[PDB]
Design a protein around this nucleic acid. Structure first.
Ligand SMILES: *[C@@H]1O[C@H](CO)[C@@H](O)[C@H](O)[C@H]1O
Ligand SMILES: [K+]
Ligand SMILES: [K+]
Ligand SMILES: [Mg+2]
Ligand SMILES: [Mg+2]
Ligand SMILES: [Mg+2]
Ligand SMILES: [Mg+2]
Lengths: 317, 185, 82, 140, 104, 213, 140
RNA sequence: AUUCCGUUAACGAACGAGACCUCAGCCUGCUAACUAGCUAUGCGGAGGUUCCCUUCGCGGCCAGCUUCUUAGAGGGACUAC
């Protein structure tokens, strides 16, 4: 029942922190995106005045950067933007290596495959497209049974034997696709309002959907059944399962709430307190978390806020 | 405080002080308030009220030298004239020419006026505006149809005004303005 | 001045009447919603409608407004009194 | 460092190279040097007794910097405002005979030659001559 | 065998001009021909300014009349016969097509 | 060979002069406009008229005379220019046709008040958003005055006037002087682009009705 | 090839600075920047160097091309292109924190060092000789 | 701003205003240029110390590229905070 405390803050961005991506190698680098239309590569110096400093700033995009994901190697980053384009970033060279064109409206979510051999993106044009990272092929997932509104999140299932894509949408449905044939498998309908985030458990046996209604519905990916429901009480912006501690974190406008899944009780509620940050490590009344990401080892949690500040929460007392 | 910026790379802003409470916040000639290497900035100072109080006092003097019509917009000549005048001021007074310029502005600004006619007080900003206008009007008048150059006339006008001597054109006009104001109290 | 005309105010109220669930408190998200749920001929007109509707969403959060009829909100009030 | 034409002040260079052309004794000044003006836009003849060498040095420096300039181009380069009494000023060209004569002299000195596309072009000897003079100017 | 053929398009209507340019580039990409363009020349703005009044009475008001000419240049690397096939398609009204063998 | 600037101006002057020649030759045949479609090997001139049977003549005699005189006058190679008559699909939405329709009613003798309301009523029946007929001149008295007949929607200012307003001006040479006819028809938004402009009015905002699924 | 190309603008003047890894050369159209003309505006062009210091430019070579505008506006365009080129170079090839430091210095002194001035000439309207100025009005 | 909020024996509309259209201001993002250029490279000239450095000229539809130029499509401001 360990709680989390504020390790430090990182202050490079000057707008909403839309997404955060941590390395799979548990390195001292994280990559964040923001509405300032830039992506920042960080150097995590735990000791010092600031928990981390911006190493690089990549600014190729023409509009807001909505999502960012790192490859398994950790030397490349993939980002989506409201200009309707995906960019693969050579982090070492700080340049753009590949441009994926085809989405006719804002891209709201991107994800790498487990092998990093395929890329999937979501867009406001109501479509999901599959790409080849090094090839030129593209396969849009358009069918009679497809999302009828904005696709706000797409995630790959961490199961190699049965590849699966889970896509939320503003039509209040959470579809589950089978990548083998690119055909719909199941449709989940239990949300009163739009869904703006989905998550898949590290084992791949669970899902977590949230959005307008402020209700987290945990589904069973294999059978597409609603196991139970958690109540955040506020609009949910992102969900992430803890890598090691079998928790589920939700970024709500009120606060960041972590539920112990086995007990279904809130482990801790993390609320921004500028008074503490002013004296601990030292604009807008309404500041809330917009992005979450766990460290590879699960020791620290990174939160991106609407004020452009990244707060690091570490397990402890 | 200390700054590495030197006007014309010749004159130091260190030690320049504005010893007058009323007009201290409307004269930009100190090291802490945006020192400038040259009195030529393509600034946008008329966008808002009280915004030209941030313009450096040396550049405000330079602008008022672009008169009359024959001299409109010839700011390179105006910057040269003030550059030469400050060199002359240093020779005659053995003082920091920036300090002499602020003293001339402080002494030549009228502090009371008549309007409608009854006596009214003058705001610190208009007091600085009047001082600049009076100093450059006197230098321009003494240079016209005279062997003496405009830079020498400007230097003498500033040296006398900074000293408070009545020989200055701007000091006499300030006394005349404040003499009529007292008559209409 | 920056007074919104009847075109902007009238359209904003209609949007909030029948899409209150979709609308948010963010201008940038709201103007992407107006593209989906309305035909606004010009970009400048779309920005003003999105900005004023975002202003009206903040108004509704604190309490009720005059010209906007939100049925679900009305039903909540009726239950309270009864 | 090793200074060339571009590395020295144009005012200093023209003075040094003009004194170099006069000192060589290769330019043959025409009969009308002392009589003429440098264009109808002028009121008086040039004040400098060595104005011809100064003009020739200036024209050599411009051919060095840009090839293809003809006589008409030099008339514009040394033209300017003509005053018309009670009427407004307008641009006027300078003398073509002065430009043409100077170009024909620098060409016999082998400082310039005919550009194939038209106009005059600096030669290899011309480049050396101008560059050597610029190198001897004292740093100032 | 392969020659650089230049196609020049002129029009007062931008949308019609851009529509024909796309139809030619896309019509040549189908044949896998090398295409250079379209290159957009600076717009020519013919301008006639004239007195509004048919007489000389009143405030002297002026009408500024403008007739804009837009010009596009497309270079196709292929034989004249193939180019004649692509350009033979019906062209939108007011768009003037001009095919010439580039002198290179 | 002439430069692009002069060629485009020369093409505009040919269109303006051709329209004037047809406006007078085909005045009493409902002439409503012309389209000049210059193509390789042939320039096609399409004549729009409400009454095409009078523009073609008996067995196409008149349309051949117009083609012949046009080819000679404008230095066209023989058998390199064609004239084609065409009918106006909706005669009541063309201001040029209604202005000429009103013109011949006034010449015939029909009263101004009655003639102007016949045009005003016909235009609104044809599916127009509005109409306005103005007649000016010596109506009955020696002194001139203006009569304005308006009905429906109308706009005056801004860019939309160019797309939504169809206006025409004609002169009626009566026995006591000249009357001035002005017909101004406001069109209706036609997404297909046939009856009216396809682009909507700038201030018209349409909210899609929500779906319940 | 660690090079950047940043521009600066003032009215119709455009200066592009090509900043590459080097030894500290700074030249405008082939001429050392110490010979910038006019000489009294030379201070404005040197402000980025004076503010940051020559040691910041010791590892770069800046070659500047400038076109359009006039004598004063070209200096401001050059002045702006140098500051932008150095900032773009430090961000891309040195470090983010060093870019943060120098950009703060440039901004604290003058925001036009990095942000262009949007002012342009207002068009003339009939009924007068200027944009605003009207023809003199007489009644009798 | 007869612009709006409200008041209210008026209610609901029509014009003008606004919207709108053109030009200008931002885009190191998109499209792509031998009638626009840049960078690099090769060769050549000149200067300085054979490499190297500075500078200029010429060439390459197979150097590369689009920052600068051009002009299409879009984005951007809404008083958003
Ligand atoms: C007369 O009718 C034609 C039909 O094409 C129309 O284009 C004109 O505007 C109208 O006057
Ligand atoms: K000259
Ligand atoms: K060489
Ligand atoms: Mg209107
Ligand atoms: Mg208007
Ligand atoms: Mg560009
Ligand atoms: Mg635009």
């Amino acid at each position: 029942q360990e709680s989390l405390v504020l390790r430090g803050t990182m202050k490079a961005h000057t707008d909403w922190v839309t997404a955060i991506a941590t390395p799979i190698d548990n390195s001292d680098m994280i990559v964040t995106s923001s509405r300032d239309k830039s992506i920042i590569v960080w150097s995590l110096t735990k000791d010092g005045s600031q928990y981390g400093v911006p190493r690089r700033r990549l600014t190729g995009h023409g509009h807001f950067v909505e999502d960012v994901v790192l490859s398994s190697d950790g030397m490349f980053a993939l980002s989506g933007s409201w200009d309707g384009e995906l960019r693969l970033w050579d982090l070492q060279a700080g340049t753009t290596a590949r441009r994926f064109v085809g989405h006719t409206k804002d891209v709201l979510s991107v994800a790498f495959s487990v092998d990093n051999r395929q890329i999937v993106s979501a867009s406001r044009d109501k479509t999901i497209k599959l790409w080849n990272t090094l090839g030129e092929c593209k396969y849009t997932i358009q069918e009679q049974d497809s999302h009828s509104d904005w696709v706000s999140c797409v995630r790959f299932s961490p199961n190699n034997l049965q590849p699966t894509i889970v896509s939320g949408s503003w039509d209040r449905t959470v579809k589950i696709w089978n990548l083998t044939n690119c055909k719909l498998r199941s449709t989940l309908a239990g949300h009163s309002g739009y869904v703006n985030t989905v998550a898949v458990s590290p084992d791949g046996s669970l899902c977590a959907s949230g959005g307008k209604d402020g209700v987290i519905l945990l589904w069973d990916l294999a059978e597409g059944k609603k196991l139970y429901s958690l109540d955040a009480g506020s609009i949910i912006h992102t969900l992430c399962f803890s890598p090691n501690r079998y928790w589920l974190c939700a970024a709500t406008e009120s606060s960041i709430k972590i539920w112990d899944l086995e007990s279904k009780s809130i482990v801790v509620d993390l609320k921004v307190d500028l008074k503490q940050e002013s004296e601990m490590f030292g604009k807008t009344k309404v500041i809330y978390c917009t992005s979450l990401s766990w460290s590879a080892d699960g020791s620290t949690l990174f939160s991106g806020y609407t004020d452009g500040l990244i707060r690091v929460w570490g397990i402890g007392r | 405080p200390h700054t590495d910026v030197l006007l014309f790379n010749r004159w130091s802003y260190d030690g320049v002080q504005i010893a007058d409470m009323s007009v201290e916040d409307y004269i930009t000639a100190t090291a802490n308030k945006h020192p400038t290497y040259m009195p030529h900035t393509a600034g946008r100072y008329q966008a808002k009220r009280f915004r030209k109080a941030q313009c450096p006092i040396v550049e405000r003097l330079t602008n008022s030298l672009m008169m009359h019509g024959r001299n409109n917009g010839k700011k390179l000549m105006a910057v040269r004239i003030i550059k030469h005048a400050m060199e002359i001021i240093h020779l005659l007074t053995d003082q920091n020419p920036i300090q002499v310029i602020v003293d001339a502005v402080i002494n030549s600004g009228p502090r009371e006026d008549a309007t409608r006619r009854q006596a009214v007080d003058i705001s610190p900003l208009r007091r600085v505006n009047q001082a600049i206008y009076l100093l450059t009007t006197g230098a321009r008048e003494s240079a016209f149809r005279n062997i003496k150059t405009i830079a020498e006339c400007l230097a003498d006008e500033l040296i006398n005004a900074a000293k408070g001597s009545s020989n200055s054109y701007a000091i006499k006009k300030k006394d005349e303005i404040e003499r009529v104001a007292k008559a209409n109290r | 001045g920056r007074v919104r005309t009847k075109t902007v105010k009238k359209s904003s109220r209609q949007v909030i009447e029948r899409y209150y669930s979709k609308m948010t408190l963010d201008f940038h998200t709201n103007k992407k919603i107006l593209e989906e749920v309305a035909i606004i001929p010009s970009k400048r007109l779309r920005n003003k409608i999105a900005g004023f509707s975002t202003h009206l969403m903040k108004r509704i959060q604190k309490g009720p407004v005059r010209g906007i009829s939100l049925k679900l909100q009305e039903e909540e009030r009726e239950r309270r009194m009864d | 460092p090793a200074r060339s034409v571009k590395d020295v002040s144009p005012h200093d260079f023209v003075k040094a190279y003009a004194a170099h052309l006069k000192r060589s004794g290769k330019l043959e000044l025409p009969e009308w040097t002392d009589i003429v003006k440098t264009g109808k836009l002028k009121e008086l003849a040039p004040y400098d007794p060595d104005w011809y060498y100064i003009r020739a040095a200036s024209m050599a420096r411009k051919i060095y910097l840009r090839g293809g300039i003809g006589v008409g181009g030099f008339r514009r380069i040394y033209g300017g405002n003509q005053r018309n009494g009670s009427r407004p000023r307008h641009f006027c060209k300078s003398s073509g005979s002065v430009a043409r004569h100077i170009l024909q002299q620098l060409q016999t000195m082998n400082i310039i030659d005919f550009d194939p596309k038209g106009g005059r072009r600096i030669t290899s000897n011309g480049q050396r001559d101008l560059d050597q003079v610029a190198g001897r100017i004292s740093a100032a | 065998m392969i020659h650089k053929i230049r196609i020049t398009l002129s029009s007062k209507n931008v949308k019609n001009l851009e529509k024909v340019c796309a139809d030619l580039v896309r019509g040549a990409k189908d044949k896998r021909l090398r295409v250079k363009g379209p290159v957009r020349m600076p717009t020519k703005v013919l301008n006639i300014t004239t007195r509004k009044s048919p007489c000389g009475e009143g405030t002297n008001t002026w009408d500024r009349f403008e007739l804009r000419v837009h010009k596009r240049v497309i270079d196709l690397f292929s034989s004249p016969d193939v180019v004649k096939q692509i350009t033979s398609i019906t062209i939108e009204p007011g768009v003037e097509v001009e095919v010439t063998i580039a002198e290179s | 060979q002439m430069s692009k600037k002069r060629k485009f101006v020369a093409d505009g002057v040919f269109f303006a002069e051709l329209n004037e020649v047809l406006t007078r030759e085909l005045a009493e045949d409902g002439y409503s406009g012309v389209e000049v479609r210059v193509t390789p090997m042939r320039t096609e001139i399409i004549i729009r008229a409400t009454r095409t049977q009078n523009v073609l003549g008996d067995k196409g005699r008149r349309i051949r005379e117009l083609t012949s005189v046009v080819q000679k006058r404008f230095n066209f190679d023989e058998n390199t220019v064609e004239l084609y008559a065409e009918k106006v699909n909706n005669r009541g939405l063309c201001a040029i046709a209604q202005a000429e329709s009103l013109r011949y009613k006034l010449l015939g003798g029909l009263a101004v008040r009655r003639a102007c309301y016949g045009v005003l009523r016909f235009i609104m029946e044809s599916g127009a958003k509005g109409c306005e007929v103005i007649v000016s001149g010596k109506l009955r008295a020696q002194r001139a005055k203006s009569m304005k007949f308006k009905d429906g929607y109308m706009i005056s200012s801004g860019q939309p006037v160019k797309e939504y307003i169809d206006s025409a001006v004609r002169h009626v040479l009566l026995r006591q002087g000249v009357l001035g006819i002005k017909v101004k028809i406001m069109l209706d938004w036609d997404p297909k682009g046939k009856q009216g402009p396809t682009t909507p009015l700038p201030d018209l905002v349409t909210i899609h009705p929500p779906k319940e699924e | 090839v660690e090079s950047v190309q940043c521009f600066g603008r003032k009215k119709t003047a455009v200066a592009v600075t090509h900043c590459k890894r080097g030894r500290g050369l700074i030249k405008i159209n082939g001429v050392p920047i110490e010979l910038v003309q006019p000489e009294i505006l030379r201070y404005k062009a040197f402000e980025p160097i004076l503010l940051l210091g020559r040691h910041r430019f010791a590892g770069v070579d800046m070659r500047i091309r400038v076109k359009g505008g006039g004598h004063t506006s070209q200096i401001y365009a050059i002045r702006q292109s140098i500051a932008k080129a150095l900032v773009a170079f430090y961000q891309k090839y040195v470090d983010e924190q060093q870019k943060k430091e120098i950009k703060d210095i440039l901004i604290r002194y003058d925001r036009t060092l990095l942000v262009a001035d949007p002012r342009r000439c207002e068009p003339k309207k009939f009924g007068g000789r200027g944009a605003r100025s009207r023809f003199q009005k007489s009644y009798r």
